[PDB]
Amino acid sequence: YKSEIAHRYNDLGEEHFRGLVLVAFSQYLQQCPFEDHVKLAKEVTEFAKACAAEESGANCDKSLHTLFGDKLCTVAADCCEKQEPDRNECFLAHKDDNPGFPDALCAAFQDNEQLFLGKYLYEIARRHPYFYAPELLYYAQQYKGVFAECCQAADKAACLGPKIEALREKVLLSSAKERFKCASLQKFGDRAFKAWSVARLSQRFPKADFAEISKVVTDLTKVHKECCHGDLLECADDRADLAKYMCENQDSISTKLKECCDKPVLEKSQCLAEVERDELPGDLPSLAADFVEDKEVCKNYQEAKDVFLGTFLYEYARRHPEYSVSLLLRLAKEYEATLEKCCAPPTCYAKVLDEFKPLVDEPQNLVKTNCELFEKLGEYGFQNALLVRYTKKAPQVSTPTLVEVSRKLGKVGTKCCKKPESERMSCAEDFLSVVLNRLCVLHEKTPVSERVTKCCSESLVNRRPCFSGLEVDETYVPKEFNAETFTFHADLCTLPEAEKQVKKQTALVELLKHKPKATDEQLKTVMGDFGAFVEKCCAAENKEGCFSEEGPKLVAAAQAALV
């Protein structure tokens, strides 16, 4: 109350506080030295620590942003002269996503652990300026755990290799997901998120009353709202409080929550987040009897629209674990929109009930078909298919972007396509919702396609629908073949396959940018000839060298195949 920095210092603790501040500066500035950030992060916590004792020390009276902003502005800047709650908005809009940035280690673990774990937070945070900081702290203590497990062992890279990567992937995905959440919260607004979380947790927690879930969602909303606005201390704190509340009344929400609440701190906050769904109790009326069969649905709808629709979202969501969170939201939107029409008459909205079936069917078909295809070519070929696809869809977009997001798109198949069929559609699009966001978040700063920004700006829920039905773009004026995109290097055959695939794919994107209306076979030819070219020349020893025949044999064969 009387001192907020002291409040958060008291509630969170010095270490988590310090870490969180370090993250804050890392995310906000991104561009500065590590030590320079540990300096500030060190000095702020001392002020906090002093004011945890003496709450009436000067400047401890202030709000967190008031201090934080001025203390930012001390760092050697048009953003700093707003000196209003707009400080942040400037500081927040100026956050660079896609910013660049590319026993010896363990020796430093024992020497200066806190520093070692600090730099992790720094590195991760500056890459991902919208990271769920608490989660990042969890990942930090995991990072602590790794070397403890492996650094005091005979073989290092064996037990260190896979676990670092395994952690890393889970860092990446986390970043992406939090970015989606905050994207909804900032670009689209409260209710979108406050609709999303309902369906999500309604799936997750059936038995739960709509009221209980409503509270949980309100709280979660608060947490992420402040968390992704730069209010990281409050986010962490309220997250902890939320987990407390969740674990307390578990018997009122879910049976499976017992496992998590025995953790120490951040751990239950993670378990809970990654706990699965309790058994649906049914029971369960028709769902027709009320929101369809009833003559009073509209009388009840008009009294409280958002409650009614929220209740419909709850009721429908819990009964269908197999539906994607996006789908259910589209169904809720359809229901609402029809209720806005049918209403101001139980004879019309007796037909809304199956207007869903198409909306349910299109995704299902999409997922099954793309999975069918996935089983055919595997991840790589799936990525290439999606690559060609999205190059056709949005050929004005940056190549490296079009590569990245297509790989991310294809990886979905590896995540959630070998699952039980019943589980395929739910996952596939939940992540698609995450991957797609990044296509646009990357597209916002540098926009070049009306259809992409439109698609991603119109509706939070109808993003995939717009992205899959997006036809081939004929407005696009294809550029002539530049010989330099097809200039190559000996290294090509020295490279690791993993980073070789990118080299193969970038060219394919660049290939379609020249002829977007190309055919399956037509591309297959050049994909064969490219192979032919690299294998003859790279095996050609004294090469290359041989690559000096780059054009006259390959491109001078490729452009013909593409007529």
Author numbering: 3 to 78, 88 to 113, 121 to 362, 366 to 584
What sentences appear in the manuscript?
Our results show that the crystals of rCSA belong to the monoclinic space group P 1 21 1, and that the overall structure closely resembles those of HSA and other mammalian albumin. The rCSA consists of three topologically identical domains (I, residues 1–196; II, residues 197–383; and III, residues 384–584), each of which is divided into two subdomains (A and B). They are composed, respectively, of six α-helices (h1–h6) and four α-helices (h7–h10). Despite the symmetrical repeating morphology of domains I–III, their asymmetric spatial alignments form a unique heart-shape structure. There are total of 35 Cys residues in rCSA. The Cys-34 in subdomain IA is the only Cys having a free sulfhydryl group which does not participate in a 17 disulfide bridges. The relative acidic property of rCSA was more clearly visible by its electrostatic potential representation than HSA was. Although our purification protocol did not include a fatty acid removal process, which is typically a powder-charcoal treatment conducted under acidic conditions, the overall structure of rCSA resembled those of the defatted HSA and other mammalian albumin3639. The superposition image of rCSA and HSA-PBZ shows clearly that the architectures of their subdomains IIA (drug site 1) and IIIA (drug site 2) are identical. It is remarkable that the side chains of Tyr-150, Lys-199, and Arg-222 are located at the same positions.
